[PDB]
Design a protein around this ligand. Sequence first.
Ligand SMILES: Cc1csc(NC(=O)c2cc(Sc3nncn3C)ccc2N)n1
Ligand SMILES: OC[C@H]1O[C@H](O)[C@H](O)[C@@H](O)[C@@H]1O
Ligand code: NA
Length: 448
Amino acid sequence: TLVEQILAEFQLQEEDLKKVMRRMQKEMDRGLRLETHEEASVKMLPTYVRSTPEGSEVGDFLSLDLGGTNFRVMLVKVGEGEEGQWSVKTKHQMYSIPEDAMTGTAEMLFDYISECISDFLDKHQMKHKKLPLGFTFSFPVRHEDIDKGILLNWTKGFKASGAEGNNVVGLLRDAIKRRGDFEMDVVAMVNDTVATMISCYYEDHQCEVGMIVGTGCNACYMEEMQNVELVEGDEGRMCVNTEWGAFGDSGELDEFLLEYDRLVDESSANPGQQLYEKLIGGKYMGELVRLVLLRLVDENLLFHGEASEQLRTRGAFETRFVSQVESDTGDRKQIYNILSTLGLRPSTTDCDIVRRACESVSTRAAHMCSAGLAGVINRMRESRSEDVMRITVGVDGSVYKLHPSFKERFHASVRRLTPSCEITFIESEEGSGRGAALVSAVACKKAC
Ligand SMILES: Cc1csc(NC(=O)c2cc(Sc3nncn3C)ccc2N)n1
Ligand SMILES: OC[C@H]1O[C@H](O)[C@H](O)[C@@H](O)[C@@H]1O
Ligand code: NA
């Protein structure tokens, strides 16, 4: 019966979440203040995207989406909307990064990206058009401005020599010149959390928070300028990229971490970093599951103590498997097919145990995540007057969007933790592309 008590290790009581939430708030304040911003696990990075935008330019914009291996190039059209700009994706193409240039230097990487941009401009007879480019770039960047900032480090298993520490917008502009054909006017670079927030903002002006729960996990929110000590000026408001994925990197999370968490971290491309993200993100969820499964087969609780060759190979339990397992109608068919595909022959109870393990991980993910969002929303509550703070959160990510019950658990948990708040959740259409374009269109009012 060792089973349910092994899975019980994943539970988090209310008071646990509240604790995580209050710590998250502590680290966010720490990241915003000059004296601690340098050492803070939660970097709270200024994005230079500011409030009261208008006016905005209109017309076609080119949008780049890297974060990464399968990155997108698309063409967004922005125009004078009702109380802001409308926008829409009119053309698009995905490109797979070759694991070769992916491993090669940064200039190799951005060369391949420059090519793909030409590939795209050809296919659509735009090669000669010279457009403003919005760059969605889903990694930690310390910005000097909206069109300048350096890669702090790669996340999410990404890596490519000689990129960290360099101006990312700089690398791209270079690679474009090392091509000859087109001239792209690189206007804005934004985190995906930000682009998503921006997309949703024109749908709902109360949306002041952007959140991604896919491969990785992160959020952004509108801060009061006087709180952004790393940008000068107490007047106005600026979006901040928390990069909360790194929360826990100074040990804020030690009392919650499980063996499976330590295994996942140690064997990761970035051991010691992004620990909070590794509790939630789809880069890691399936693998947590795999490790739990293996621990069960070792206590002879599962598959009759016999793991298959595949189940023993790192990364074999894809996050989408977790999501299919929890979609099982209860005829175990879905669960059987996955497990079989992994070289296993599950009994009826094997399947039910595996479903249990999936629910335990994805439920912990949903709650861990709800603590951070609640921490952000409750921080923002401090700066609002009305009795009930009504606020909208824009969200994107496969885990949040596609996993059968993650979002329900998440919503309920966030609400428990955020009294005197009315939270509305919006999912973003093409939040990355249209988000980057919308921001470019406003940034163009000063550089175009
Ligand atoms: C310096 C600079 C460059 S681009 C820029 N502004 C934007 O792109 C932009 C910012 C927001 S943030 C905001 N304001 N009120 C509420 N919210 C969430 C909303 C829409 C936008 N198009 N500032
Ligand atoms: O893609 C979602 C998130 O993944 C990681 O946490 C990146 O560091 C962050 O910048 C990004 O927003
Ligand atoms: Na300031």
